Amino acid sequence: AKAKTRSSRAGLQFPVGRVHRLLRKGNYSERVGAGAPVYLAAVLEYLTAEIL
DNA sequence: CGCTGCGAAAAAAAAAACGCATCCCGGTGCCGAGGCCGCTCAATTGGTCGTAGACAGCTCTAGCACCGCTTAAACGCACGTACGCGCTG
Ligand SMILES: [Cl-]
């Protein structure tokens, strides 16, 4: 019943959920692994901080 | 005479005066950030299905050594010429 947001499970502020959707609806591939969005929201957050 | 000293005279160069532009100080005032209000649709859960990819091997390619013959490049040096380089008007 209690739904923790994946972004929390990675300790990322970047939305690992919205990254997963954007990828599947991006037409990048047929199938997205479940680590991929994590890995990507991570890298995104990181470069966001590096500039900020 | 030469030396010299000075007295320009000539720039140097300095300094200093002028005036101009760039900074900064401190109080206006304006607008857009930043923070609340609800609310709606996109993320989560959990759970079913079916197939992408991990593995365990089987093949035969094609990539890595070795090896002298035969050249055509490389190395290299010497001589000389055309070019790059800098100053002035
Ligand atoms: Cl993954």
From Swiss-Prot:
The chain holds residues 13 to 64 of 130 of the full protein. It comes from the Eukaryota. There is a cross-link at residues 2, 4 (Glycyl lysine isopeptide (Lys-Gly) (interchain with G-Cter in ubiquitin)). The modification N6-(beta-hydroxybutyryl)lysine is found at residues 2, 25. This is Histone H2A type 1-B/E. Belongs to the histone H2A family. Core component of nucleosome. Nucleosomes wrap and compact DNA into chromatin, limiting DNA accessibility to the cellular machineries which require DNA as a template. Histones thereby play a central role in transcription regulation, DNA repair, DNA replication and chromosomal stability. DNA accessibility is regulated via a complex set of post-translational modifications of histones, also called histone code, and nucleosome remodeling. It is involved in the initiation of both imprinted and random X inactivation. Ubiquitinated H2A is enriched in inactive X chromosome chromatin. Ubiquitination of H2A functions downstream of methylation of 'Lys-27' of histone H3 (H3K27me). H2AK119Ub by RNF2/RING2 can also be induced by ultraviolet and may be involved in DNA repair. It is found in: Nucleus; Chromosome. The modification N6-crotonyllysine is found at residue 25. The nucleosome is a histone octamer containing two molecules each of H2A, H2B, H3 and H4 assembled in one H3-H4 heterotetramer and two H2A-H2B heterodimers. The octamer wraps approximately 147 bp of DNA. Signal peptide: none annotated. The modification N6-(2-hydroxyisobutyryl)lysine is found at residue 25.
